[PDB]
Amino acid sequence: NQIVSGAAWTDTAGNTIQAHGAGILQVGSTFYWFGEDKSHNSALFKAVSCYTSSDLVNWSRQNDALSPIAGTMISTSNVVERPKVIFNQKNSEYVMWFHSDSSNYGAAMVGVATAKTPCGPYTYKGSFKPLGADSRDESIFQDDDSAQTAYLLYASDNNQNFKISRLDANYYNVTAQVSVMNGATLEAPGIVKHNGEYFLIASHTSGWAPNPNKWFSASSLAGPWSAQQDIAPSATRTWYSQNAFDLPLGSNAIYMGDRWRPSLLGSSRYIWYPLDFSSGAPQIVHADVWSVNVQAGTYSVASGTSYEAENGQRGGSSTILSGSGFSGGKAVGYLGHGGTVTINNVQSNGGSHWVALYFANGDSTYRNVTVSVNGGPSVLVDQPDSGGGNVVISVPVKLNLNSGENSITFGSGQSNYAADLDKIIVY
Ligand SMILES: *[C@@H]1O[C@H](CO)[C@@H](O[C@@H]2O[C@H](CO)[C@@H](O)[C@H](O)[C@H]2NC(C)=O)[C@H](O)[C@H]1NC(C)=O
Ligand SMILES: *[C@@H]1O[C@H](CO)[C@@H](O)[C@H](O)[C@H]1NC(C)=O
Ligand SMILES: *[C@@H]1O[C@H](CO)[C@@H](O)[C@H](O)[C@H]1NC(C)=O
Ligand SMILES: OC[C@H]1O[C@@H](O)[C@H](O)[C@@H](O)[C@H]1O
Ligand SMILES: OC[C@H]1O[C@H](O)[C@H](O)[C@@H](O)[C@H]1O
Ligand SMILES: [Ca+2]
């Protein structure tokens, strides 16, 4: 089973996974994924969900880890974001931290809850401002010293100043500032310790819109920290995502991000990629389809076959576009609204296959494209805004192919313009 960024992910019961703003905890060889339940299409608090898996693909929904409490700061009128859980060895206790806020983000607190088992349910113990100052986007990092010292990483002072501060021995309170990046406008933080060095991954502040996420490193959490560098090509806006959790994996890591859909928040998707450290620093591997070997601490990227859209057969009013951002320097434009392209001679062993559509969409809103395989009934594929007419991203579609040769037609029947199609990759 494969990790396929941007698809609609469902749990073992077949229900949409609702765990945005991910926090991960490993117990044994089980991964616990905590997140925000947005099934109600709202930024206000419904639950902190809890899912488990052995392989980072096949997730079983457990009891919710945190439920709202009326008349408190975790009421259903309030905001609970970006939950994180670490285990406290001294107390044999799981401690959850989260961003605790009002609906207009004017309160800027953390909240804390505890449990004796990983999915809890957890008992909320209150919300507070760390050292009396704002905390909005946050994460928690647990170091590998004998004391397992933990730290809050947080956007402070109306998001302008990024802070790292040490937690007490219970992981209940922030008690000393460790470093601050004044004017850094960083949010969505996480830290992975790799080769003895601390690596901070963070986004800048653009609300729900994605932006180029950055890495910084230091030999001490007190700094000095290096200046920001990109984890992905800047035009792609972190391949249309925002950092949520950075999970170590052998000699590398896994980038776990959210693709926020602010007009329909429960349909926000999950963008998980290998975070390769072979250059000495974290770089996203743009892997449409990949898997993890947990015991070996490795990842494997699926190989596919590319087909350029411009080499297909156009029908109707579609055109050939030229641009440096496209594979082959070309793409097919004016798709939909009477224009089609058919990609022929797609060889396959048949059955269900992931097919990545590489496209550009310069609008600020989603487009979509109809897809028919071998003349079968049409499906509709969402095409998010890509960041520019010359900026290509990819979305996955799990198509049923025939054993042998296949033809795939794009854009038939739809009155709206689809995105511009650069190529497809058949896995
Ligand atoms: C497929 O994409 C089209 C746009 O290419 C969507 O049509 C837009 O729908 C919104 C409503 O969310 C309207 O406000 C816009 O005026 C429409 N734009 C155009 C150009 O028609 C359509 O909703 C998408 N289909 C699905 C199922 O999401
Ligand atoms: C998915 O997880 C469930 C629960 O542990 C397990 O019973 C099932 O076999 C898993 N599916 C696959 C394909 O391994
Ligand atoms: C948390 O630590 C700060 C800094 O020492 C202190 O001012 C505050 O009173 C502490 N909070 C609690 C609940 O002990
Ligand atoms: O207005 C519709 C047009 O939008 C452009 O962004 C696109 O490059 C064209 O191929 C066509 O779809
Ligand atoms: O404010 C809306 C939204 O803004 C950013 O995307 C933050 O990283 C999210 O956690 C959320 O707070
Ligand atoms: Ca192309």
Residue numbers in the entry: 22 to 448
Passage from the reporting paper:
In this study, we solved the apo and liganded structures of Pc1,3Gal43A, which reveal a glycoside hydrolase family 43 subfamily 24 (GH43_sub24) catalytic domain together with a carbohydrate-binding module family 35 (CBM35) binding domain. The N-terminal catalytic domain consists of a five-bladed β-propeller (Gln21–Gly325), as in other GH clan-F enzymes, and the C-terminal domain (PcCBM35) takes a β-jellyroll fold (Thr326–Tyr448) structure, as in previously reported CBM35s.
The binding mode of Gal−1 is almost the same as that in E208Q_Gal3, but the C-1 hydroxyl group in the axial position forms hydrogen bonds with Gly228 and Gln263. Comparison of the Gal-bond structure (i.e. WT_Gal) with the Gal3-bond structure (i.e. E208Q_Gal3) showed that the fluctuations of Glu(Gln)208, Asn179, and Thr226 of E208Q_Gal3 were smaller than these in WT_Gal. The role of Asp158 is thought to be a pKa modulator; therefore, its function and conformational stability might be related.
